[PDB]
Amino acid sequence: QIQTNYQKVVYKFDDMELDEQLLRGVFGYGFEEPSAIQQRAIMPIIEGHDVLAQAQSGTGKTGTFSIAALQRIDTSVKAPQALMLAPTRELALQIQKVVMALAFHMDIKVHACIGGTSFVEDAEGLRDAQIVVGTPGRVFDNIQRRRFRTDKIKMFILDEADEMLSSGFKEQIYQIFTLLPPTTQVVLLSATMPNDVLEVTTKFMRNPVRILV
């Protein structure tokens, strides 16, 4: 069914060497055993590889990168380390809901960079929030406004990449790449793999792990 260039599969969260607090979040949220994409996509992300994974919206996909990002987060460092992008505010808010639930036993702040936030709450949340989830436009407007510190960023997650691009966010996304440290891990999830998505993959990914179909 699935196709990957990564040859290690993990069928139980207990074998992923997750952080104790994180593991409690995973079971506490209702996760029992990893889904098919999770058994294949979680460890490569946790490990630093750029990742291209074809997956439809849902508890499996979102869990994949939310679980993986929380594991890479250094709880002490109170600054953005992971940046998640989603097609819309609602999708962004949903990701926040999930990540915060998986992080219920960890000291981690998740700020949503979307529309409706005054310049105040925006700057206060973006400063010490180790995980920032939002939409291309709001996120870029903040950087172009110099209200988003990216020097501590480690990973860049593009959720539902095909929908983001089909919405005319290529420019924001591309410009966002430039404002991130060269060393940042890149993760892209998309239900479909159209030209535009492949383009971004070859453009910003370094011999990435590929989980197709």
Side-chain angles (χ1 to χ4, degrees), residues 2-126 128-143 145 148 150-213:
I2 299 170
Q3 186 175 312
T4 175
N5 49 18
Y6 185 79
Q7 41 219 46
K8 198 171 178 181
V9 174
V10 178
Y11 304 101
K12 261 68 172 57
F13 295 111
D14 308 86
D15 290 314
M16 288 175 187
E17 297 178 284
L18 258 42
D19 176 285
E20 337 63 41
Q21 298 312 309
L22 174 58
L23 184 49
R24 289 189 57 176
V26 183
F27 295 141
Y29 185 51
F31 282 123
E32 290 303 287
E33 62 156 53
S35 57
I37 256 50
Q38 281 167 171
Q39 299 155 14
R40 299 175 176 58
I42 289 179
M43 292 315 293
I45 300 177
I46 290 175
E47 281 152 24
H49 299 90
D50 286 333
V51 184
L52 164 70
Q54 175 160 24
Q56 216 314 73
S57 278
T59 257
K61 187 194 66 184
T62 305
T64 288
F65 67 79
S66 302
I67 293 168
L70 288 165
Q71 180 56 49
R72 288 213 59 201
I73 289 289
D74 179 50
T75 165
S76 71
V77 178
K78 306 298 182 171
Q81 297 174 51
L83 200 216
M84 310 179 172
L85 293 192
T88 72
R89 302 180 57 255
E90 39 270 53
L91 299 176
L93 282 173
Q94 181 189 314
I95 291 174
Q96 165 159 53
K97 164 253 302 177
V98 176
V99 170
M100 285 177 62
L102 278 301
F104 200 57
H105 306 286
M106 312 181 262
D107 177 40
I108 293 183
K109 176 182 164 186
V110 171
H111 173 265
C113 186
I114 60 184
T117 172
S118 53
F119 73 89
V120 164
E121 179 183 303
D122 227 317
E124 270 172 45
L126 286 177
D128 58 359
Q130 301 116 308
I131 293 183
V132 180
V133 51
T135 47
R138 326 281 193 298
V139 171
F140 178 59
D141 288 310
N142 274 98
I143 299 179
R145 200 85 56 171
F148 193 163
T150 65
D151 56 66
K152 278 296 184 300
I153 299 286
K154 296 204 286 285
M155 53 197 298
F156 188 38
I157 302 163
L158 305 175
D159 187 43
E160 288 186 292
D162 46 19
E163 295 304 313
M164 220 130 73
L165 269 5
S166 299
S167 296
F169 291 137
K170 180 195 294 191
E171 195 49 46
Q172 289 78 7
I173 293 178
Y174 275 28
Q175 281 164 155
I176 289 174
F177 278 98
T178 75
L179 313 157
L180 273 42
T183 177
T184 78
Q185 179 183 195
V186 181
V187 181
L188 177 152
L189 307 309
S190 189
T192 67
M193 292 294 142
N195 292 159
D196 278 347
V197 172
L198 302 167
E199 180 176 308
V200 190
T201 295
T202 70
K203 287 192 174 301
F204 306 108
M205 279 183 251
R206 189 180 193 180
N207 184 208
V209 52
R210 289 167 285 170
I211 305 182
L212 319 186
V213 179

